[PDB]
Design a protein around this ligand. Structure first.
Ligand SMILES: CCCCCCCCCCCCCCCCCC(=O)OC[C@H](COP(=O)([O-])OCC(O)COP(=O)([O-])OC[C@@H](COC(=O)CCCCCCCCCCCCCCCCC)OC(=O)CCCCCCCCCCCCCCCCC)OC(=O)CCCCCCCCCCCCCCCCC
Ligand SMILES: CCCCCCCCCCCCCCCCCC(=O)OC[C@H](COP(=O)([O-])OCC(O)COP(=O)([O-])OC[C@@H](COC(=O)CCCCCCCCCCCCCCCCC)OC(=O)CCCCCCCCCCCCCCCCC)OC(=O)CCCCCCCCCCCCCCCCC
Ligand SMILES: CCCCCCCCCCCCCCCC(=O)OC[C@H](COP(=O)(O)OCCN)OC(=O)CCCCCCCCCCCCCCC
Ligand SMILES: CCCCCCCCCCCCCCCCCC(=O)OC[C@H](COP(=O)(O)OCCN)OC(=O)CCCCCCCCCCCCC
Ligand code: HEC
Ligand code: HEM
Ligand code: HEM
Ligand code: HEM
Ligand code: HEM
Ligand SMILES: C[C@@]1(c2ccc(Oc3ccccc3)nc2)OC(=O)N(Nc2ccccc2)C1=O
Ligand code: FES
Ligand SMILES: [Cl-]
Lengths: 75, 241, 67, 377, 147, 61, 251, 49, 48
């Protein structure tokens, strides 16, 4: 297990932090959050969606075909 | 005859997410089981004491247990004997074993009903549709003697003759004993038999939703409170040149 | 003597435009295979899909007359 | 300072308090602690179910009903244990899928120890499902145990040796109860070695880039984030237990076991349907049984098939699409696994089984190589 | 020493003395007319006892034996063609086939799709062997002893 | 009430951890009585006819 | 050198191979490893007894007889488990008596963790004796459980709560079986914390004088000495199991 | 919440509904002459009459 | 249990057949008597 003070080397980097009792826990939750969700959805929709759309079409066709095959045809 | 007909969804009063059983319908449904079903169907996992505080008083349920005779013993001579039922007895089985049952029902075996609603897809919707769904065989279907056409039963050929009909019993509260009425009450009772915790679980479910509706945003708020130190932190890089 | 609510709701559902076609196609099958000499086909299919429409309509209204 | 020097608390401090953790691990890193919460939930509920359970074939079915009818709040403990097992497999597959997407498998000891944890939890849950002695319990035990009969020249001996007889019977159920009791405690011990090897390197993060330049202490950041995730796990569990306790089970299991008749519509639990579908797409007995085992053991090969010069798929679009083609393909096998062996499901299940192994072995490693060339390295 | 302990713990899991004490079954042949598959119980698993018609005996007699997965002629499985006795366990993974069903007019296994014929031989599906045939003899024309 | 409500709760009850814990244990006591009382009154209002305690009057004895 | 750097073998090396140990620890220091051997013996034999045991009051007695009559070598596993429990208490009292004589109790965390181990093994063996459901099993459960009735103002509630009824009955036996199954695994975990605190200081020795001036590696000196002692433990166990299996029990 | 779970697991160990369903005992007084202690069974434990 | 201790299998079988024990149900749901076999436990003299 590693420990702080032995992780890596860093130089010339300043970090400004504010106390949690000094700031909001939900700053602009909807006024800023909803735009960010839409940005992230657009960036990944084309990678995630087409596979499951392909599943949905194969699912419905296979179920429709299985239903029709079980119904008899006139001789 | 491998075609299937699935039961429709009837609007049972316990269908909803927060909706309890109707205990008046349970009470009437027990009367259907006792008078009509109990002569062919066992209920090995329900005892008279289970009725107490659900649909009968203790005195009522005691008197109900005393209406039948059950075996007990041995006595001091090593003999078994009969006594009136008490609250601790399970409902009497109609047959000692399934072989006698098959012999008494043209070879078919009436299943135990303690769990019938949970052991069949569609639950009370299936049972309601089966009891109330008998009809003449379609053209070209000829069932052997002993079997009865019922389109909701798998294979459409069932060894149980239609067991309910108008005025099969009289209800204690005067309710008209129509086929659909008797079916609705017996199905409600059978649901309770298979899931006695139904009402209590729905009450707990309501409390669980309300507490989660409190705890989820508060715990979420604790997470963001601590994390706000990091989420608003600002970085700057000032290397020597 | 005693009027079951199932009777008065059943025939009411059968006048709907969706299921009157199912009863028609069933009575057709009754006449098709009755005419053959020796066959093995039956009208189980044409009956079940008729009950699927009627029993579906019975459930929405039936329970409003029961206690 | 006393948290650091005490021989016992130093282990707790260096694992849950002062542990350096990446500042950017997403919600997909929550399933590690939820797997431990699930393991502790199953041990507690399971232990209270063993206080009112009998492994006699003639009373095993009735002892479970006795719990759900007469034991004070025995039913809620019972359905927490059953649904908790399903929640266990939800967390397992997300934990695994997290590691595949973000390249966490490059921790070989942690990953390989992980594969061992998956198999033991699978063995544990299989035996657990046999205990209530319903129809699916018995025929679930029949089918899965008979898989060893496919092993040439020793298979029947291994099967009959495991059964304690010429078929699944009373001797098989009593020992499955002993195994189901003890195997969770071995899992907890192996989960500690899982964490032991992990702490050597610390956690990966969504970018796949080393995070030693930006680390935060586990407390209070990931203690509260893990607490929030647990409350969401309890929400998911209690929705099943308190509003739909039979949705994930099979109704035939409420009928006592009967060795003389098998139900017509065999449907395993949802968490085995994808692998059940792989097996039956192969009609050969030994071939289908090997394909079943290889559909899981292939995880041990994923580290050897890594071709990309980047660790995570966050910056790998071509791999992302193939990754989601694997999830949808696994979702297809789960669907085919729940349907009977008939046309067209037989051919769909065969094509999906080929696509499953084709993605892992061929397409995904080739995508990682195309991506390297596209970036000119 | 280590072999003896590991061996004894191994045999502990092997079937106990009472399990191995399986007794034979008396089957009343007058309860089984032609075209019927009476299902009994033996060793825990089903014991199908079936009476075949002439339309079945000559059907299975005429068959390309070289093309079968487990080649075995119908005559060398049953002592008497009229009587056939089978273990009701599927050879694939131990399910119980449904009698007088399937394409071949024999037995069909709903679990994964194994097809058998009136002789119990494997013809299609994933099962690798014919249904098990126990050792039996006809002591008389009314009783059959299985074992 | 010129001082803020949350401000007076902090100075009196939340500053010390001891009184911060006492307010919680005393809060869970009074919360349990009021939450179960209100929750049960809601479950019973939706199901006013259906429950047994709504029918116990018929069966006097 | 690879024994020292692997994350998992380093724990094994620093506990059983390169562990500095006193050069003069007598045979009374052998009972520590024999307690672990006993704990592993009871888990293995006990686990194989649970494969053929039923906690039903109507068949619990018969399931044990079924082990000793029909299960292949079930009797030898059974009497190893029973006599192994007695050997467990022989080692406990010698382990404790060793520490009292030689002052090893001055390791407070190790000693106090030890007292916890003694009580849990006592609780484990008490419940184990109730499982076969003989006369002494039942009345042993009656007397010892009723001890809680002596606790004022809550005693009967604790007793009836533990019994699951107004007396020892089927509900009491089924849960005692669950406790008897799981409690040995908690003991094994507590035995690791026992050893964790011990290794902070290393072992005491017969003289009570610090031994850092003369230490020897645990391997090969105390690996072979512990192996020899285990063979003597097996001898003591197998004499009971194979020549007098009822000498320590009650008819 | 934590009280409710710990309470419900506590009551799980408390005697089940069937255990609490103890029925009384009919004792035939003509079987007990003077100087005798007839031993019956009630609730599991002996009932000396 | 007697087999190979103090009687042969044939001897122990004949010994079991010297007593009648209860078995069933048959197809009518009735219990009946048959000769003992090797798998039967020794008959109890009293039901309780
Ligand atoms: C019902 C079951 C819940 C299904 C879970 C769906 C999975 C999911 O996307 O959750 C993200 C959620 C947020 O994770 P994160 O750490 O912020 O980012 C994860 C990846 O980085 C995420 O990758 P990304 O950066 O590309 O972000 C993907 C985008 C995903 O966006 C979507 O596709 C969802 C948009 C829905 C529109 C809502 C309108 C109403 O995520 C979001 O914007 C967060 C979801 C916000 C939900 C708002 C609902 C209102 O992830 C989880 O917590 C995992 C699933 C949790 C299951 C909860 C049930 C118990
Ligand atoms: C039958 C069950 C065995 C009973 C065990 C008796 C306890 C005992 O003294 O064993 C010492 C034996 C030798 O221990 P050690 O590390 O050399 O010295 C221990 C103290 O420092 C010993 O303190 P110490 O330095 O004052 O020595 C006391 C003296 C004890 O001397 C005696 O009182 C015994 C003399 C018997 C005469 C034998 C003539 C035949 O110990 C010896 O000389 C060793 C015993 C030699 C046995 C020869 C038998 C032939 O200690 C053990 O192994 C403990 C008991 C083992 C139980 C074995 C059963 C499994
Ligand atoms: C030895 C003890 C071991 C315990 C191990 C438990 C393992 C954790 C399982 C988590 C279960 C979630 C709560 C079940 C609620 C229930 O079921 O309670 C049902 C009760 C009503 O009950 P009632 O209507 O009878 O009225 C009660 C009589 N007055 O209200 C609730 O819903 C309360 C729950 C609120 C919603 C859940 C919030 C989750 C918080 C997590 C706290 C977990 C504590 C951890 C304890 C180890
Ligand atoms: C094994 C049998 C399984 C049977 C069950 C199968 C049912 C599957 C049902 C579908 C589950 C879908 C889960 C929801 C997936 C949401 C994906 C998403 O939110 O977008 C992709 C996301 C993008 O995030 P990046 O980290 O790339 O960059 C973020 C920069 N803003 O990137 C991610 O967040 C990806 C993280 C990994 C997702 C894990 C899903 C794995 C599914 C199971 C895999 C099983 C493998 C054996
Ligand atoms: C004898 C005169 C019976 C009466 C009275 C009742 N039932 Fe019955 N039932 C009977 C038999 C012989 C069978 C077996 C049918 C078969 O072919 O296997 C049954 C079965 C049922 C079932 C199970 C249906 C299924 O899906 O398997 C149910 C749900 C059922 N019976 C319900 C029921 C009820 C509610 C009755 C009282 C109103 C009742 N039955 C009476 C024989 C007899
Ligand atoms: C009982 C089962 C398991 C438990 C309790 C468990 C627990 C954990 C925990 C607590 C972590 C650290 C926190 C986290 O990343 O969420 C972790 C990390 C990890 N686990 Fe598991 N795990 C289990 C099974 C598995 C399996 C089956 C695999 C893979 C086949 C696996 C692979 C990994 C990997 C690769 C990591 C490192 C993730 C990272 O650093 O990004 N685990 N596990
Ligand atoms: C990883 C841990 C575990 C998992 C995933 C698991 C899973 C399961 C499952 C799926 C069932 C079937 C439930 C049903 O069909 O109703 C079950 C039953 C059971 N389990 Fe577990 N289990 C675990 C640990 C334990 C432990 C530790 C114990 C006991 C100490 C236990 C005791 C039982 C008992 C007695 C049953 C039978 C009662 C029942 O069917 O509900 N389990 N388990
Ligand atoms: C399951 C029960 C126990 C096990 C497996 C166990 C195991 C061990 C082991 C392996 C050692 C180091 C080797 C040795 O000194 O022999 C040890 C040392 C020690 N144990 Fe235990 N022990 C147990 C119970 C106890 C109890 C009940 C006590 C006291 C009440 C205790 C007190 C000590 C002490 C003081 C030492 C240090 C001895 C020395 O350094 O000279 N132990 N134990
Ligand atoms: C420190 C560990 C253990 C001790 C000291 C111990 C002790 C005992 C004792 C004294 C008995 C009474 C034996 C008799 O009267 O015949 C017993 C019985 C039993 N034990 Fe254990 N036990 C331990 C661990 C275990 C474990 C881990 C299991 C199961 C996984 C187990 C399963 C059983 C069973 C099934 C019985 C009943 C059979 C019998 O009476 O022989 N025990 N145990
Ligand atoms: C709960 C269950 C189970 C548990 C665990 C389990 O592991 C795995 C999960 C994923 C991959 C590999 C293994 N695979 C099944 O055990 C059981 O009998 N069935 N059903 C059943 C019925 C008929 C045939 C086969 C199975 C289950 O679904
Ligand atoms: S189990 Fe019969 S075909 Fe597989
Ligand atoms: Cl059940």
């Amino acid at each position: 297990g590693r420990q702080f003070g032995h992780l890596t080397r860093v130089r010339h980097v300043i970090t400004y932090s504010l106390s949690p009792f000094e700031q909001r826990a939900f700053p602009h939750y909807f006024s800023k959050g909803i735009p960010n969700v839409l940005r992230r959805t657009r960036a990944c929709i084309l990678r995630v969606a087409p596979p499951f759309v392909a599943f949905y079409l194969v699912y419905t066709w296979g179920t429709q075909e299985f239903e029709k095959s079980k119904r008899k045809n006139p001789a | 005859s491998d075609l299937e007909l699935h039961p429709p969804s009837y609007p049972w009063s316990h269908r909803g997410l927060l909706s309890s059983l109707d205990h008046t319908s349970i009470r009437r449904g027990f009367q259907v089981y006792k008078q009509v079903c109990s002569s062919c169907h066992s209920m090995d996992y329900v005892a008279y004491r289970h009725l107490v505080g659900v649909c009968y008083t203790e005195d009522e349920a005691k008197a109900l247990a005393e209406e039948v005779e059950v075996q007990d013993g041995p006595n001091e001579d090593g003999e078994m004997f009969m006594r009136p039922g008490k609250l601790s007895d399970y409902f009497p089985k109609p047959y000692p074993n399934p072989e006698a049952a098959r012999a008494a029902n043209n070879g078919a075996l009436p299943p135990d009903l303690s769990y019938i609603v949970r052991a069949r897809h569609g639950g009370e919707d299936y049972v309601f549709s089966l009891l109330t769904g008998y009809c003449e065989p379609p053209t070209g279907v000829s069932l052997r003697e002993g079997l009865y056409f019922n389109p909701y039963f798998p294979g459409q050929a069932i060894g149980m003759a239609p067991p309910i009909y108008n005025e099969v019993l009289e209800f204690d509260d005067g309710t008209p004993a129509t086929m659909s009425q008797v079916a609705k009450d017996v199905c409600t009772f059978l649901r309770w038999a298979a899931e006695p915790e139904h009402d209590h679980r729905k009450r707990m479910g309501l409390k669980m939703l309300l507490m989660m509706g409190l705890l989820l945003p508060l715990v979420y708020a604790m997470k963001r409170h601590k994390w706000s130190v990091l989420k608003s932190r600002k970085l700057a890089y000032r290397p020597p040149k | 003597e005693l009027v079951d609510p199932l009777t008065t709701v059943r025939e009411q559902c059968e006048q709907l435009e969706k299921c009157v076609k199912a009863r028609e196609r069933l009575e057709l099958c009754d006449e098709r295979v009755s005419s053959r000499s020796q066959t093995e086909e039956d009208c189980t299919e044409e009956l079940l899909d008729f009950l699927h429409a009627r029993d579906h309509c019975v459930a929405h209204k039936l329970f409003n007359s029961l206690k | 300072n006393i948290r650091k020097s005490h021989p016992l608390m130093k282990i707790v401090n260096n694992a849950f308090i002062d542990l350096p953790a990446p500042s950017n691990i997403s919600s997909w890193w929550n399933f590690g602690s939820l797997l431990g919460i699930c393991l502790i939930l199953q041990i507690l509920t399971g232990l209270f179910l063993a206080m009112h359970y009998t492994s006699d074939t003639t009373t095993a079915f009735s002892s479970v009903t006795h719990i759900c009818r007469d034991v004070n709040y025995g039913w809620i403990i019972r359905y927490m244990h059953a649904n908790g097992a399903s929640m266990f497999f939800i967390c397992l597959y997300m934990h695994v899928g997290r590691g595949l997407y973000y390249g966490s498998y490059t921790f070989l000891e942690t990953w390989n120890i992980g594969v061992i944890l998956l198999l033991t939890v699978m063995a544990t849950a299989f035996m657990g499902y046999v205990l209530p002695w319903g129809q699916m319990s018995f025929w679930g035990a029949t089918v899965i145990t008979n898989l060893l009969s496919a092993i040439p020249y020793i298979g029947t001996n291994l099967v009959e040796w495991i059964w304690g007889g010429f078929s699944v019977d009373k001797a098989t159920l009593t020992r499955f109860f002993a195994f189901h009791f003890i195997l969770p405690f071995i899992i907890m011990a192996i989960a500690m070695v899982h964490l032991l090897f992990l702490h050597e390197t610390g956690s990966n993060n969504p970018t796949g880039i080393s995070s030693d330049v930006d680390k935060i202490p586990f407390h209070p950041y990931y203690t509260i984030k893990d607490i929030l995730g647990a409350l969401l796990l309890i929400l998911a569990l209690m929705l099943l237990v308190l509003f739909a306790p039979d949705l994930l089970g099979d109704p035939d299991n409420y009928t006592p076991a009967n060795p003389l008749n098998t139900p017509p519509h065999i449907k395993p639990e949802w968490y085995f349907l994808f692998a059940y579908a792989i097996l039956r797409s192969i009609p050969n007995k030994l071939g289908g049984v090997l394909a079943l085992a290889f559909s899981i053991l292939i995880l041990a090969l994923i580290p050897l098939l890594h071709t990309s010069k980047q660790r995570s798929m966050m910056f790998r679009p071509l791999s992302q699409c193939l990754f989601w083609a694997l999830v949808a393909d696994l979702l297809t096998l789960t669907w085919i696994g729940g349907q009977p062996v008939e046309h067209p499901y037989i051919t769909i299940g065969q094509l999906a089984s080929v696509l499953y192994f084709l993605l892992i072995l061929v397409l995904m490693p080739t995508a990682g190589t195309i991506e390297n060339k596209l970036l000119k390295w | 020493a280590a072999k003896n302990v590991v061996s004894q713990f191994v045999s502990s899991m092997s079937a106990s003395a009472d399990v191995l004490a399986m007794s034979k079954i008396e089957i009343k042949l007058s309860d089984i007319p032609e075209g019927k598959n009476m299902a009994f119980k033996w060793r825990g698993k089903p014991l199908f006892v079936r009476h075949r018609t002439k339309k079945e005996i000559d059907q299975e007699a005429a068959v390309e034996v070289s093309q079968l997965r487990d080649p075995q002629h119908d005559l060398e499985r049953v002592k008497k063609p009229e009587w056939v006795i089978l273990i009701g366990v599927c050879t694939h993974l131990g399910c119980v086939p449904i009698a007088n069903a399937g394409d071949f007019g024999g037995y069909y296994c709903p679990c994964h799709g194994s097809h058998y014929d009136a002789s119990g031989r494997i013809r299609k599906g994933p099962a690798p062997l014919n249904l098990e045939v126990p050792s039996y003899e006809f002591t008389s024309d009314d009783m059959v002893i299985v074992g | 009430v010129a001082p803020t409500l949350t401000a007076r709760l902090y100075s009196l009850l939340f500053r010390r951890t001891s009184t911060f814990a006492l307010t919680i244990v005393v809060g869970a006591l009074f919360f349990e009585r009021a939450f179960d009382q209100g929750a049960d009154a809601i479950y019973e209002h939706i199901n006013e006819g259906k429950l047994w305690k709504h029918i116990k009057h018929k069966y006097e004895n």
